[PDB]
């Protein structure tokens, strides 16, 4: 679908059997979502933005499943304020920005 | 245009009379944008972001071209690590993310 923005661009995402709600976030390289289950192995790894640094934990290759895509990439979980589908991911359902 | 996203959406803004690069970011609330000199009034504001929050300034009514649209609203200043165009602006050159 097109996405205009007067409001924030939450999209529902199914990811580790489980349903939440996310911001199609063209300015987040990586996608971030809050303390989560996720399977498998992860490394932690540090992210930044606006107003610092935040801990978090690495899932590579996870498949998701955005507004009704399936895309495959690298999670993050951790003490993010929002859940954020950064670039990695927004590539693989060709999401594209427009005006 | 339309802009694909497997790299990050900088696009040349003019501001101030001044030119600078910044992302298109559909995850922001608000425009931001890094130490610069701007005319006017302006009342001391905080944002937040993943890591935390910077103290910024808030100048209401810029006008600002982005990517060749103008556009008039709301800017923050501050020590922001990067340049970023928010939702406030990018309703108004009429940006739309689609997939
Ligand atoms: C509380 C919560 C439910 C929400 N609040 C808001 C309102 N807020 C605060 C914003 O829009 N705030 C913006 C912001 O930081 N947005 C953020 C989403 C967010 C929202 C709330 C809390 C934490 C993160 C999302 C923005 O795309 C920023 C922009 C950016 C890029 C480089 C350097 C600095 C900044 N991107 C990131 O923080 O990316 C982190 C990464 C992802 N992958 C790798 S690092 C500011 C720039 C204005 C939306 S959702």
Redesign the interface.
């Given at each position: 679908?097109?996405?205009?923005?007067?409001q924030?661009?939450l999209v529902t995402i199914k990811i580790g059997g489980q349903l939440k709600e996310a911001?199609?976030?063209?300015?987040?390289?990586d996608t971030?979502l809050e303390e989560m289950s996720l399977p498998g192995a992860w490394k932690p790894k540090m992210?930044?933005?606006?107003?610092?640094?935040?801990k978090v934990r690495q899932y590579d290759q996870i498949l998701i499943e955005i507004?009704g895509?399936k895309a495959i990439g690298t999670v993050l979980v951790g003490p993010?304020?929002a859940n954020?589908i950064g670039?990695n991911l927004?590539?693989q359902?060709?999401?594209?920005?427009?005006?």
């Open positions: 679908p097109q996405i205009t923005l007067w924030r661009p911001l199609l976030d063209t300015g987040a390289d971030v992210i930044g933005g606006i107003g610092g640094f935040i507004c895509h993010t304020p954020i670039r927004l590539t359902i060709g999401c594209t920005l427009n005006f």
